[PDB]
Design a protein around this ligand. Structure first.
Ligand SMILES: C[C@@H](O)c1c(O)cc(O)c([C@@H](C)O)c1O
Ligand SMILES: C[C@@H](O)c1c(O)cc(O)c([C@@H](C)O)c1O
Lengths: 205, 210
C-alpha cells in the first residue's frame, strides 16, 4: 500500500516534470512517505523511476492480458480485434493518465532504465502482435513485412492515446472517439493493409 | 545587413530549440538561452519580443522542419493522381526520418503535446490543421469520400501515425523491439503506400455501403 502509493504519486510527478526535474523530497511530500521507506522499497530514486516506467508500460496494456487473448480460441483476426479493443478502450476509460506521458518522456531522453522496459515489456508485447500479423499474412513473425506491419497497426492507437485532445478539437474537428467506430475502422483498415503487403511479400518469395 | 540580422535571429532560434528540446519550457531560463546562443538578453527580446515569443517561434520552426506547409501545397497542386501525391507526402516524412535521426524538432513538439503551453493552439491552427487538411483531401479523393467524412478523419490518423511513431521511436524499435527492422527509405515508403491503399480501399467499401 505504501509501495503502491509511492509508485502512483511518483508516476504523476515524473509525468508532469520528468525525471531530471523531480526531487526525492517532492516524491516524499506528494506520497507522504519517508525517504527510508522509499529507500527500503525501491533502493533509490533510479530504482523507483525504473518501477514507475515498468508500471506505466503495464497500465498501457498488461502482458498477461495479451497472453490470455493470444491463447484463447479464435482466428488471429478476432485476436487482433481484441488487442486493438484493449488500446481503444484505454482511450475511453483513462484519457487523463500519467502512464503514456512518462513513457513518451522516456522515449525522447532515454535513461539507463529504458533498455529494461524495452526488453521486459515492449519486446514481448510487440512479439504477440507480430505473431498475430504473421498468422494473418502467412509470414514469419520476424519477416521484414511483419516488423513494418506492427508499426502500421500499433502506431494509430498510440497517436490517439497521446494526441486525442488536440486532434479532436483543432486538427481533425469532427473526429468521434466512440470506441466501436474506431475499432471497426482500425480492424477493416489493418486487414486491408496486411492483405496488400502480404501479396507483395509472397511475390518477392 | 538584413541577412546579418536574420543570422542572429536564427542563431538564437537554433540554440533555444536545442535547449527547449533537452529541458522543456518550464526548466529553461533566458540566462541559459543567452549563454547557449552567446547573445545578450537585448538581442533575444529584439528578435522575439520575450521568452514566450521565442518559445512560439521555436514550435512553429519545429513543425516547419518536420514538413513545410509550402511543400505539401506544391505537391498537392502538381498534376498527378492522389496516390502519386500521397506517395510524395509520405516520401517527405520518411526522408526526414532518414536524414534527421537526432534533431530537436520532434522532441520540442512532443513535450508540447504532453504538457501544452498557451503557444500550442497556434501551432495546431496554423501548421497542424492545414497540413492534415491536405492529407485528408488526398485520402478523400482515394476513397471517393468528402475530406471531412468520419472515415477520412480516422484514415488521416491511420496514414500519418506510423510516420510519426518512426520519427520519434526509430532507435528503440530497431535496437530492442523490432530488431531486424530495415528503415531503408524506399522499402518503408513502398510498405506505407501498399498498406495505406489496401486499408483505404477497405474502409471506403464499408463507408459507401453504410
Ligand atoms: C502493446 C503492444 O501491442 C506494443 C507495445 O507495448 C510496444 C510496441 O513498440 C509495440 C509495436 C512496435 O508493435 C506493441 O505492439
Ligand atoms: C504533415 C501532415 O501530413 C500532418 C501534420 O503535420 C500533423 C497532423 O496531426 C496530421 C494528421 C492528423 O493527419 C498530419 O497529416
Amino acid at each position: 500500500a505504501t509501495r503502491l502509493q509511492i509508485l502512483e504519486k511518483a508516476g504523476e510527478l515524473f509525468a508532469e516534470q520528468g525525471l531530471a526535474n523531480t526531487t526525492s523530497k517532492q516524491i516524499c511530500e506528494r506520497s507522504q512517505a519517508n525517504s527510508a521507506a522509499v529507500n527500503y522499497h525501491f533502493v533509490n530514486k533510479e530504482g523507483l523511476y525504473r518501477a514507475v516506467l515498468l508500471e506505466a508500460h503495464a497500465r498501457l496494456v498488461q502482458l498477461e492480458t495479451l497472453v490470455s487473448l493470444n491463447e484463447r480460441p479464435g482466428s488471429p483476426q478476432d485476436k487482433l480485434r481484441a488487442l486493438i479493443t484493449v488500446l481503444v478502450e484505454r482511450l475511453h476509460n483513462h484519457p487523463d493518465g500519467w502512464a503514456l506521458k512518462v513513457l513518451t518522456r522516456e522515449v525522447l531522453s532515454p535513461s539507463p532504465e529504458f533498455e529494461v522496459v524495452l526488453k521486459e515489456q515492449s519486446f514481448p508485447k510487440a512479439h504477440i502482435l507480430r505473431g498475430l500479423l504473421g498468422q494473418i499474412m502467412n509470414l514469419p513473425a520476424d519477416h521484414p513485412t511483419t516488423l513494418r506491419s506492427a508499426i502500421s497497426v500499433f502506431a494509430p492507437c498510440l497517436f490517439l492515446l497521446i494526441a486525442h485532445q488536440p486532434l479532436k478539437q483543432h486538427v481533425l474537428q469532427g473526429l468521434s472517439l466512440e470506441p466501436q467506430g474506431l475499432i471497426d475502422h482500425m480492424m477493416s483498415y489493418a486487414l486491408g493493409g496486411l492483405q496488400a503487403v502480404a501479396a507483395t511479400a509472397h511475390d518477392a518469395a
